[PDB]
């Protein structure tokens, strides 16, 4: 006879990509419970200006902040075929 | 005889892509319960200006902030075929 | 007879990619429970300007901050085919 | 008869890629519980300017800070085919 | 009869890639519990400027700081085909 | 009869890649518990400028600091095909 | 009858790659517990400038500091095909 009485008080605060918390696998027989690996198989005239949290062609996880991002300017981007006198 | 009495007080606050919290798999026999891996198989004259949280061609997760983003300007983007005198 | 009475008070704060916390595998027989490895199989005229947390072609994890990011400028990006007099 | 009464008060603060904390594997027989290795199999005219936490083609983990990042400028990126008089 | 009464008060603060903390493997028979090795099998005209925590083509772990990063400038990146008079 | 009453008050502060802390393997029979070796099998006209904590093609561990990184400049990177008069 | 009552007050502060602390292997029979060796099998016109903690193609461990890194400059990197008058 198997008996379980789990109690999990979980608090997740400002944690984006969290995974597999507070899980209870109770049984009389169990093969490969909780199988959650993280496998990664990585095979391998423009004037641009970028500011802030940016992704271009990624497969990456959650990008965030918990707080304040203060005033940003990006003041002046004079590029291709431009002429000033 | 299997007996379970789970109790999970879960609190998720400002956590975007969270996954697999507070799950209870109770049985007399169980094969591969809770299978949730994260597999990634990655095979491989314009004047632009960008400000803020930006994604262009990604397959990435939730991008966010919990707080304040203050005044931003992007004041002045004079590019292609432009003429000033 | 197997008996378990787990109690887990978990607190995750400002921790993005956390994984496999507070999990309870109770049984009378169990093969390979909790299988969660991290396997990585890595096989191998533009003027650009970038500011901030940036990913271009990655398969990387959550990028974040818990605090304040103060005023940034990126003031002046004069590149391709530009002329000034 | 197997008996277990675990109690884990866990606190994770500003720790991104944490893994396998507070896990309880209770049974009468158990083969290879908690299998979570970290295997890595690594086989092997533009003017650019970058500031901040950056990833380009990586498969790396969570990059973050817990604190303040102060004002940054990236003031002046005059590159390809540019002319000034 | 096996009896266990673990109690683990764990605190992880500003520790990114931590692993395998506070885990309890209780049983009457157990083969290779807690198998978590770290195996690494490593087989082997642009003007660039970079500032900050940067990864280009790595498979490395979490890169972070717990504190303050003060104002950085990257003021002046005049490279490919540039002309000044 | 095996009896165990572990108690581990663990504190990890500013320690990134820590591993295998506070783990309790209790049983009546156990083969190769706690197998966690670290095996490493290592087989073997651009003007660049880099500042800060940087990885290019590594499989290395967590790189971080716990404190303050003060103002850095990288002021002046004039390289490929550049002309000044 | 085997009896154990371990108590480990562990404190790890500013120690990155620490391993195998405060682990308790209690049983009536145990073969090769705590097997964690560190095996290493090592078989064997650009102007560059680098500042800070840097890894290029390594499989090395956590690189960090616990303190302050003061203002660094990298002021002036004039290399490939450059001309000044």
Author numbering:
A (entry chain F), B (entry chain G), C (entry chain E), D (entry chain D), E (entry chain C), F (entry chain B), ...: 9 to 52, 68 to 108
Sentences from the paper on this structure:
Systemic AL amyloidosis is a rare disease that is caused by the misfolding of immunoglobulin light chains (LCs). Potential drivers of amyloid formation in this disease are post-translational modifications (PTMs) and the mutational changes that are inserted into the LCs by somatic hypermutation. Here we present the cryo electron microscopy (cryo-EM) structure of an ex vivo λ1-AL amyloid fibril whose deposits disrupt the ordered cardiomyocyte structure in the heart. The fibril protein contains six mutational changes compared to the germ line and three PTMs (disulfide bond, N-glycosylation and pyroglutamylation).
3D reconstruction of the fibril images yielded a 3D map of the dominant morphology with a resolution of 3.1 Å, while the remaining minor morphologies could not be reconstructed. The rise and twist of the reconstructed fibril are 4.76 Å and −1.46°, the pitch is 117 nm. The fibril consists of a single protofilament (C1 symmetry). The ordered core of the fibril consists of two segments that extend from Ser9 to Thr52 and Ser68 to Thr108. For residues Gln1–Pro8, Asp53–Lys67, and Val109–Ser118, which are present in the fibril as shown by mass spectrometry (MS) (see below), no well-defined density could be discerned in our map, suggesting that they are structurally disordered. The fibril protein fold is defined by buried electrostatic interactions, such as between Glu84 and Lys46, and by several buried patches of hydrophobic residues, such as the one formed by residues Val10, Ala12, Val34, and Trp36. The fibril quaternary structure is stabilized by an interlocking of the protomers in the direction of the z-axis that is caused by a 14-Å height change of the fibril protein backbone. The carbohydrate can be seen as extra density within our 3D map that could not be assigned to the polypeptide chain (red star).
